[PDB]
Design an enzyme around this catalytic site. Structure first.
Site, short mmCIF file in Angstrom:
data_model
loop_
_atom_site.label_atom_id
_atom_site.label_comp_id
_atom_site.label_asym_id
_atom_site.label_seq_id
_atom_site.Cartn_x
_atom_site.Cartn_y
_atom_site.Cartn_z
N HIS A 191 1.72 9.16 1.97
CA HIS A 191 0.52 9.00 1.21
C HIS A 191 0.58 9.99 0.09
O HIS A 191 0.94 11.14 0.32
CB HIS A 191 -0.74 9.24 2.05
CG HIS A 191 -0.84 8.40 3.29
ND1 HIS A 191 -1.57 7.24 3.32
CD2 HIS A 191 -0.20 8.47 4.50
CE1 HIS A 191 -1.45 6.68 4.51
NE2 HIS A 191 -0.62 7.39 5.26
N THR A 224 -5.10 5.15 9.54
CA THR A 224 -5.91 5.39 8.35
C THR A 224 -5.94 4.25 7.34
O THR A 224 -6.54 4.43 6.31
CB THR A 224 -5.46 6.67 7.63
OG1 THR A 224 -4.22 6.38 6.98
CG2 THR A 224 -5.34 7.90 8.58
N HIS A 276 6.34 6.75 6.47
CA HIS A 276 5.77 6.46 5.16
C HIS A 276 5.11 7.72 4.62
O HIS A 276 4.98 8.70 5.35
CB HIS A 276 4.77 5.32 5.18
CG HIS A 276 3.60 5.60 6.09
ND1 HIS A 276 3.62 5.34 7.44
CD2 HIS A 276 2.44 6.27 5.84
CE1 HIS A 276 2.51 5.78 8.00
NE2 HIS A 276 1.72 6.32 7.05
N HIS A 312 4.14 10.68 7.21
CA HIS A 312 3.77 10.23 8.55
C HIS A 312 4.96 9.59 9.24
O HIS A 312 5.45 8.56 8.73
CB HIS A 312 2.65 9.20 8.45
CG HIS A 312 1.35 9.83 8.03
ND1 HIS A 312 0.24 9.13 7.58
CD2 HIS A 312 1.00 11.13 8.04
CE1 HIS A 312 -0.71 9.97 7.30
NE2 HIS A 312 -0.28 11.20 7.60
N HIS A 333 0.82 -1.22 0.00
CA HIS A 333 0.00 0.00 0.00
C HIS A 333 0.86 1.29 0.00
O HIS A 333 0.44 2.27 -0.54
CB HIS A 333 -1.11 -0.05 1.10
CG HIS A 333 -0.65 -0.16 2.55
ND1 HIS A 333 -0.48 0.95 3.38
CD2 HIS A 333 -0.52 -1.25 3.36
CE1 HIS A 333 -0.10 0.56 4.57
NE2 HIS A 333 -0.12 -0.79 4.59
N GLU A 382 -3.88 13.06 3.27
CA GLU A 382 -5.01 12.48 4.03
C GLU A 382 -5.71 13.59 4.80
O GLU A 382 -6.89 13.80 4.63
CB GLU A 382 -4.46 11.39 5.00
CG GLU A 382 -4.17 10.10 4.21
CD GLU A 382 -4.12 8.85 4.97
OE1 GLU A 382 -3.48 8.96 6.10
OE2 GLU A 382 -4.63 7.85 4.50
O1 LIG Z 1 -2.23 4.95 9.14
C1 LIG Z 1 -1.49 4.56 8.18
O2 LIG Z 1 -0.92 5.19 7.24
C2 LIG Z 1 -1.55 3.09 8.22
C3 LIG Z 1 -0.62 2.42 9.19
C4 LIG Z 1 0.46 3.03 9.74
C5 LIG Z 1 1.24 2.30 10.58
C6 LIG Z 1 0.91 1.07 10.97
C7 LIG Z 1 -0.13 0.44 10.43
N1 LIG Z 1 -0.49 -0.83 10.84
O3 LIG Z 1 -1.50 -1.20 10.30
O4 LIG Z 1 0.11 -1.57 11.85
C8 LIG Z 1 -0.92 1.12 9.52
NI NI Z 2 -0.18 7.10 7.29
#
Ligand SMILES: O=C(O)Cc1cccc([N+](=O)[O-])c1
Ligand code: NI
Ligand code: NI
Length: 257
Positions: A93, A195, A91, A116, A61, A103
């Site tokens: 988005h 998210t 990471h 993030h 993702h 987001e």
């Molecule tokens: O919110 C996000 O971008 C998703 C996110 C981020 C970090 C961990 C995650 N997990 O599912 O353990 C998911």
């Molecule tokens: Ni995130």
């Protein structure tokens, strides 16, 4: 089998994760006019001097830059937080077009992407336990706009070709996440969630007011990544953002007047 498409996207998630329709879901629109300045708020402390990056992973993702979180090497404290939160990963988005991808939104404005930095509360011992707690995570969110290049991003952009498909990783040592922070640490804060599934309501969000600028060429490289595995049909990793959710009975606080 969730994702970002017509048939498995955010609008479907609630059937597997009913917490999707919960009381403290993220992201949200930040209404700058209704956020209240809180003088209780302590200044944010970002302590990244000893950060030890390890690896970069395409998880199907997004891509995650992972850190060694087995000691207090890179920590967030202060602001709205009680206690110490350890950096585990960052990471992004992003969109298919420069006009969407973040987001969070600010007065309904969408940025090109959002970074993030995910941290877990040390009082719970590990990440897995922390996500089960209402104060288990603190996510520092930084908006990206397209303009000048961000020199400190370029090391991430040039490894992307080595992790094109789902499940690929690469060694990613000696990366300094300080080079992704804007000048000001002015912020908004509110209680929310992950998210992506499992959508757990374990996050104190800290969203910086000042965006960083990246180049068009840098963002373009993000859009060449793939959601699929190698040897499966190509689907570009774009639009991996959840849209804004209802604020419900929350207040967003501002660290600044
Ligand atoms: O919110 C996000 O971008 C998703 C996110 C981020 C970090 C961990 C995650 N997990 O599912 O353990 C998911
Ligand atoms: Ni995130
Ligand atoms: Ni699934």
């Amino acid at each position: 089998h969730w994702g970002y498409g017509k048939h498995n996207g955010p609008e479907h998630w609630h059937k597997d994760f009913p917490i999707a329709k919960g009381e403290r879901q993220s992201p949200v629109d930040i209404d700058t006019h209704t956020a209240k300045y809180d003088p209780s708020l302590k200044p944010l402390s970002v302590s990244y001097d000893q950060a030890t990056s390890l690896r970069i992973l395409n998880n199907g993702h997004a891509f995650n830059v992972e850190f060694d979180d087995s000691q207090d090497k890179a920590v967030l404290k202060g602001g709205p937080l009680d206690g110490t939160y350890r950096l585990i990963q960052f990471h992004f988005h992003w969109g298919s077009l420069d006009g969407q991808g973040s987001e969070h939104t600010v007065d309904k404005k969408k940025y090109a992407a959002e970074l993030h930095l995910v941290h877990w509360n040390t009082k719970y011992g590990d990440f897995g336990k922390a996500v089960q707690q209402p104060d288990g995570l603190a996510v520092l969110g930084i908006f990206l706009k397209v303009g000048s290049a961000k020199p400190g991003l370029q090391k991430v952009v040039d490894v992307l070709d080595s992790i094109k498909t789902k499940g690929k990783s690469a060694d990613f040592t000696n990366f300094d996440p300080r080079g992704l922070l804007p000048e000001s640490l002015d912020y908004w804060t509110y209680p929310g969630s992950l998210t992506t599934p499992p959508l757990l309501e374990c996050v104190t969000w800290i969203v910086l007011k000042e965006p960083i600028s990246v180049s068009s060429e840098q963002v373009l490289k993000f859009r060449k990544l793939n959601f699929n595995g190698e040897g499966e049909p190509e689907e570009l990793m774009v639009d991996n953002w959840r849209p804004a959710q209802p604020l419900k009975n929350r207040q967003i606080k501002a660290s600044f007047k």
